[PDB]
């Protein structure tokens, strides 16, 4: 660590999570595909408060829902917005992404492709869980702190 902050358990952890490679796979609990036709209402009840909140200051009827894990989410210094905006800056306009705010009890990410409206998604899931990098450097997996 830098000459000054070399005796900070925290300045290390920060640098740790910043070097340790992290993919969505290490944060995701489970990914599911649903047939949710109305982009407004949702067959999924728990996902109403998330779409209701997306009308304040094209899309396929198929849904890709990801249920993240708070334990890893905060253990690897990751924000829903960060994760989301990364996925978003990965699939371009090609994908419609929305996620639940850090405050909600459940961290959910729902995506829609934007007729083969099925296979693409099952591939998109794969690419997300493994190919997208949320934080860290490529090739660096384990990263341990010592004194």
């Amino acid at each position: 660590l830098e000459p000054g902050h070399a005796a900070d358990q925290e300045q290390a952890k920060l640098i740790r999570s910043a070097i340790e490679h992290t993919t969505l796979k290490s944060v995701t609990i489970a990914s599911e595909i649903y047939y949710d036709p109305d982009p407004r209402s949702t067959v999924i009840p728990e996902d109403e408060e998330i779409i209701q909140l997306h009308f304040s200051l094209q899309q396929s009827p198929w849904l890709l829902r990801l249920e993240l894990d708070r334990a890893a989410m905060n253990d690897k210094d990751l924000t829903m917005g960060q994760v989301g905006e990364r996925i978003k800056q990965t699939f371009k306009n090609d994908l419609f992404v929305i996620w639940s705010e850090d405050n909600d009890e459940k961290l959910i990410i729902r995506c829609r492709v934007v007729a083969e409206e099925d296979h693409m998604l099952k591939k998109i899931e794969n690419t997300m869980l493994e190919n997208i990098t949320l934080r860290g450097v490529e090739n660096i997996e384990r990263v341990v702190m010592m004194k």
């Binding site: 591939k123 794969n126 869980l129 493994e130």
Partner: protein, 391 residues
């Protein structure tokens, strides 16, 4: 007065052990193996392929140890003499041929394992042995060839007819393999290996499952094999693999399998599919479908059955392998331990002496069938076996 139903103590164990060693000695491994060969295995090798396109072989006899003399009568041979005179402690190998016109006999020599049922010393008393100039402490689980005592070291090898799933190297396109080396006890040991491979690693576009059939220059998607077996409906096929209707995880792994064999929807289309991957471009469908039927009935899982009406037996066993494969692939089980001694086998005198005798009986068989094809109007090379073994 020492109730005979009283418990036992540690010291009482040596009594039991002495009993063991009194009955088996220290080389029962040598004797019992070789003895099974002479008593059963042998006669069972003469009956297999005992008919030539007639001449049929029957019963077998085993002489006591004798010697091939030069300028003299045949002599009874004893160990102490075979070692000294550099002779071979072997015995006669007669048969019982039946020459039937269809458009005792001495054959070969078998070296005898000291103290086996067929050996003189086996019955010799402590006194008889002394007279024969043979130490009564000699254990005797070996042979005497050209004067020198030869021991056959136990050969360790993997067991056969055992399913085994193994993971693989990251670079390879296949992540898991379910293997089994089928073989037959009698007749011969056609070790045709069947492999059920799971293409794709954790996280690839549709992981498919294909099997490796002998003589087929391409891996065939499993669904097609099940249909060449007469199990057509996806429902039925998946039922032969997954034995739990609620196991949505395993069934999910088979989804890409179903799509992989979607083109074929009947036993014929299945057989022809397989037939082509093992035939030239000019062969007729009928011949192709036939070729595939024979491959699945003779070169596909032969340890189970090789007769005709047993397609359900092989279908369930194939499904069982798929089941084991995915089980490992789903991380519910670890890849089999290739070092477990339970799945190991040690081949001794008998088994070892059997592979040779078989190989030689077939060579002697060829030397007799030739004495018929070339015949227009006893002509048996006994040495074909004698020096074949001895060698």
């Amino acid at each position: 007065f020492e109730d005979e139903s009283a418990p036992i103590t540690a010291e009482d164990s040596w009594a039991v052990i002495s009993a063991f060693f009194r009955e088996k000695g220290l080389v029962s491994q040598q004797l019992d193996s070789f003895n099974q060969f002479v008593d059963y295995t042998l006669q069972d090798i003469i009956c297999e392929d005992s008919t030539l396109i007639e001449i049929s072989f029957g019963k077998i006899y085993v002489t006591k140890p004798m010697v091939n003399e030069s300028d003299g009568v045949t002599h009874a041979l004893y160990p102490q003499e075979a070692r000294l005179r550099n002779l071979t402690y072997s015995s006669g190998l007669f048969v019982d041929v039946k020459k039937r016109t269809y458009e005792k006999v001495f054959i070969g020599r078998l070296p005898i394992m000291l103290r086996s049922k067929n050996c003189y010393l086996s019955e010799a008393t402590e006194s008889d042995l002394y007279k024969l100039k043979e130490c009564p402490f000699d254990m005797g689980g070996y042979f005497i060839i050209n004067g020198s005592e030869k021991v056959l070291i136990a050969q360790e090898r993997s067991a056969g007819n055992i399913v085994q799933v193994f993971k693989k190297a990251a670079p390879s396109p296949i992540s898991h393999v379910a293997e089994i080396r089928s073989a037959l006890e009698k007749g011969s040991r056609f070790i045709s290996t069947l492999q059920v491979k799971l293409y794709g690693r954790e996280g690839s576009s549709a992981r498919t499952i294909k099997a490796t059939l002998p003589y087929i220059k391409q891996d065939i998607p499993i669904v097609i094999i099940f249909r060449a077996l007469g199990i057509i409906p996806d429902g039925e096929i998946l039922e032969h693999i997954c034995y739990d209707v609620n196991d949505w995880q395993m069934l999910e792994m088979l989804k890409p399998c179903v799509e992989d064999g979607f083109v074929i929807q009947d036993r014929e289309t299945a057989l022809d599919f397989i037939g082509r991957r093992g035939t030239a471009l000019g062969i007729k469908k009928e011949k192709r479908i036939q070729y595939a039927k024979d491959i699945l009935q003779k070169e596909f899982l032969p340890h189970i059955t090789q007769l005709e009406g047993f397609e359900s037996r092989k279908a369930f066993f194939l499904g069982y392998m798929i089941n084991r494969l995915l089980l490992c692939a789903l991380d519910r089980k670890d890849q089999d331990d290739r070092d477990h001694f339970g799945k190991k086998r040690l081949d001794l005198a008998g088994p070892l002496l059997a592979q040779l005798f078989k190989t030689l009986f077939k060579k002697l068989t060829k030397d007799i069938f030739r004495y018929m094809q070339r015949t227009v109007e006893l002509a048996i090379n006994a040495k074909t076996i004698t020096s074949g073994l001895k060698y």
